């Protein structure tokens, strides 16, 4: 379901910066060129997210992470809520 | 023995619900998730399959229709507003550091233009807010924000584009409308339903046209009994007999052109004495 | 072993079913009801003599015991407590419903209960022997309706204590052993190549820690394996685990609890709970047969999904991403499904993913 | 039903939670405070110490120490003596 | 009722309105906190004041400028004690037969 | 007596003798934590001595959580070498214990009311605040939490001998109130 | 926000903007406002564009919390997605 | 300090109020009253007699509107339960609330756990736990001359 | 639905007579007219369901710690009920493995105690095979007490104590 | 109500909500009514200069 998210985000960025580009003068053609080049550009493990709560019990870490993106084995996953446990 | 009885009673006080043993029968204790998916489930998902959950159909409630209408309207507004909001903020940030009075006046003109466009947006009537019944919205945003998650994105999408969008005639069928429906059905043959919905002179989808045709289609049921029909009915009844109260539905679903009403009437009146 | 409770009315301690059957058979040897022969002045003398021998009394004592202990219709009177409430319910129903005819859902469960009890085998060579240890298992219907989370439907089967699992397995009428796969979006008339029963024959029973995998049919695989994979690494409850072959193993070879949920997984993800209602010894007034013996005696009579365009037929086709369907998963009978798509040469119209629907209210 | 026994008043736990969630004001580096301090002076010629603290979001003692080095107090008989953000 | 609603503004805005008045029987509270009806004779002997608790319904509505209004009613809020005239409608002796009055050591 | 108290926690302190940046240490230390908006110190935990060291800008460190005097000293020296490695002139000045919590069990439920009535001048027992009695021993200045299950939690000490003396003093007094 | 401009998507944004600016047809400003809006849009969408439950179990080795950002280093950690299971030897989690 | 002094005065006079009851009439929280209470005792070099379950029965039962017979039964149940050590380490207010619930359920005037907790200042869970400890020996705790509207055998399941 | 009441009423009426004679039971049956307890318009399902419940009730009455008089009464009750049904498959009595081990020595005592009426009733109920021998009682998914005091102190116990004293 | 406003003003100024019960001073009505009947000085004790006297007398 990842690429649907990226399509949504890309459309979002485009209809947002459309007026900015019409304002500063950047014609729509350059904008669509950016869009296309970005899409084509789309083709270590890191989780970047927002922690809703990180709890510790003397060894036991319990993470409750909000919206986040992961880079597990080169393939990038999405999650809207990630509970997790760990032992120090 | 008495102390053993007391221990039994205590463990009764200290004594799972058969709810904790549904589809993820093996739930974890450190988490709530079950075991990973099975290679058989992988193979079954591939080659296509419909799991039990994916087949659940819930009848739409009255209030859900209003909720979807309000959701579509609000998200159309947000999508229309985000560009102008960013334009206005960019103009203001440019004014903050322009330090040129003629350029500042040009920027204030552009900002007044942006504000005027925003005012036109927030005064746009409901019609232009609706759309062309085929436009796009962040339906995955709807299903998670406006709806609690009770409906999938594509479900809402199909309900909206095909059914709920107010550009679809929901009125009753007039004599003239029913006449035209069968007229066009005959002219095209009882197959070409999209073109018929188009030619009907109304915005009723092909689905509703076919519904109104079937509900008055006499060839839907055979209405006349034949001996081979009777033979098949007897064979089926004897196969799925339980004594009395033969399931007529599961019999119909093995026959063609018949419904449980006619099967009941036939089995009672001409397939057993009485 | 002993069927001794574990909880007051919800469970018992795990016991070997074979030993239980053996204890019952032993404590009923030559003095038990293990005859299985239906009931039929000279016989009176023999009965009196037997009574005298068993009760250490005289022949006259046996005769007078037989005489004194002899055996001793709708309208009622001279009320009692329960007869009072019965009469009141009946009169209330009399002022009530005009059609006394029995409900079609009571007759269903009744006939399913008495479908084939009191039907003796026509072969009389396969008829079960005495002490055959009938286990009245009930398999939980899968969650195929929302209402099935609330009140868990189930079908009861009278498994036999020598029925050799992979016989119960081969007999459980679920609909996950159906549902011809594949998507027919450009093929209105497609031969069903293989029902899911034929394709994915693997399945297993989880009973008291141990797994029993359907290693028969070498087009099968080990569905239990996956579970073991994460019970060995990152223990998440459930401790130790074991596995068996389910083919040599028959019933009464187990060590199980009653009223305690156990698992039957077939087709990979369909899950079936295998609570054992009770183990009772074989007795007459039932089939006594062997062929039909698994004996599904109760079933849920589920609802039947009808077509969405017309309501006069059942749902043969389920479509998604349709261009005419109001709802996303839309159920069409074959008639109208052929008329909202596939026009005049059997070529796709618009766009839709059409899958074959089995309508489980109809099957199994 | 009046004055029912309670361990803590609802208005008091909410205020306590808000104070805990907000946390104590941190002592930022002098350079950042000075840069923010003078930017405030731009909007208004004269600033009150109590109101100035909110803009800087710095401890009162720390703000006074930095303000004392450059800022000066001007006595106004109309209301009171306030601080001057002008170094001279 | 005639009292103007109390308006607080210092941002959130709080409104207080005193709706309805309740009066209970003349009550006395023992040192342990147990209430009990106060007989006029007990008041005379123990030098108590023959008073009835006074309660008022108060509605508290708060406007937080977020276009959200929260309204809570504090039913029967104790606001003090009113001395009670004897043999008045709100006195314990009200509606007591002469025999009942004698049982209470009242003439 | 016969029951020796098991130590459970030891708060000691040490002086590094050099001012530090908490930002630097926090960004460059392995298991450090530093949220100044909530507390002005760096919380560095280590596993083998299983200790928690709070390090302060002034150069003073407090090591807690170790269950031995020697173990506490070793954890302190570990944190000292850690800070030394991050580019600071760490030193080891006046490593001094500041608390030692001990805990033990006497294996019999106690009647509190008897004890509080017997030593009203010492015990502060209020079961609606804290369900244990708090006996403030005076000869050694050690606070003893005594519970109805017999668990005695001595605290406030400055050496192990003090906990031992205090528990031996308190033992017969509890023996007298075995429920 | 300076958090989500590090994944494959954000790296693609940065690379595309770099290629476009090196071509001398946009200004660095338009690039930085586009990046700022990208951050806002991804923050908004990454919130209500998805709903797939995950739960991970791992052995935490290193953690750090400066300027309200958590940095965990998990070893041999498994990620239970809705359906499947992912195993990774070592993952850095950054949370703020 | 005033709130803590008010709490101490009630104890000294033999009519203790619970810390929650004092907090209800004071803007100061229970924790701060309890802390000042300890300091005031140290500063004054004085002490307060330990509270007993019978120190609250009259106020709790009168506020719940229980008859004198039910109040006497609750007073006996709590006092007997403490003597029998069926609730070791329990707060006296928790024991009293459970005893009132037991006595209330054994008479015509029946009060729910929420009702008793609101007056007693004890969460219904705490009443449930204390009640569950004294329920097994219910017949022993009740006064001999108590008229059971609900028989002790049929006392409420918990 | 109140059947427990009439069953307990019959048990009490029988134990009050202090009889083991099945003739007194037959008279109590004819007087209370249990020949009707099943009689009434039921189709088949309520019928056999209520019969199952009544048999289970009589059986659980038969078991300890109930009094010997009550036990023999419940045995006669089981006999009468099972021998009086309307359903063609005469519902069987659910008998456990644990309870069978005690019903054995109970029948043995009945023979020994010259209570041949109840002994013959039980032998008959076994002969017509009215027993479904189950594992755990009834199924599985998801009082007149016997004082220990008299087991500890009897008239014979105190008599022997005083003799030896 | 004057002291209810004054009490609530202090709490609302500090940004915290106020407890309505703690805002009410029950002495105001209880003692004010009692004092006027107790002494016969009619009005306020502080303003006894203008208070009408002899209104309340011992029966
Ligand atoms: Zn299945
Ligand atoms: Zn159809």
Numbering used by the authors:
A (entry chain U): 9 to 51, 332 to 376
B (entry chain c): 110 to 124, 140 to 398
C (entry chain b): 29 to 68, 76 to 107, 120 to 411
D (entry chain R): 151 to 238
E (entry chain B): 60 to 69, 81 to 177
F (entry chain O): 159 to 337
G (entry chain V): 3 to 98
H (entry chain M): 159 to 316
Task: Pull verbatim passages from the article behind this deposition.
Transcription initiation of snRNA genes relies on a specific factor called snRNA-activating protein complex (SNAPc). SNAPc binds a DNA motif in the upstream region of snRNA promoters, referred to as the proximal sequence element (PSE). The core of SNAPc binds two turns of DNA and recognizes the snRNA promoter-specific proximal sequence element (PSE), located upstream of the TATA box-binding protein TBP.
We obtained structures of the CC and OC states at an overall resolution of 3.4 Å and 3.0 Å, respectively. We observe 19 nucleotides (nt) of the DNA template strand spanning from the TBP-binding site to the upstream edge of the DNA bubble (at position −12). The templating nucleotide in open promoter DNA reaches the active site of Pol II ~30 nt downstream of the upstream edge of the TBP-binding site. The DNA strands forming the open DNA bubble are mobile, leading to a weakly resolved map. Subsequently, 12 nt further downstream, we observe T (position +1) of the template strand immediately downstream of the catalytic Mg2+ ion at the active site. This posits residue G (position –1) as the template for RNA synthesis. The CA dinucleotide is the signature of the Initiator sequence (Inr)34 and is located at register –1 and +1 of the non-template strand. This observation suggests that the TSS position is defined by a fixed distance from the site of TBP binding, as is known for protein-coding human genes that have their TSS within a window of 28–33 bp downstream of the TATA box.
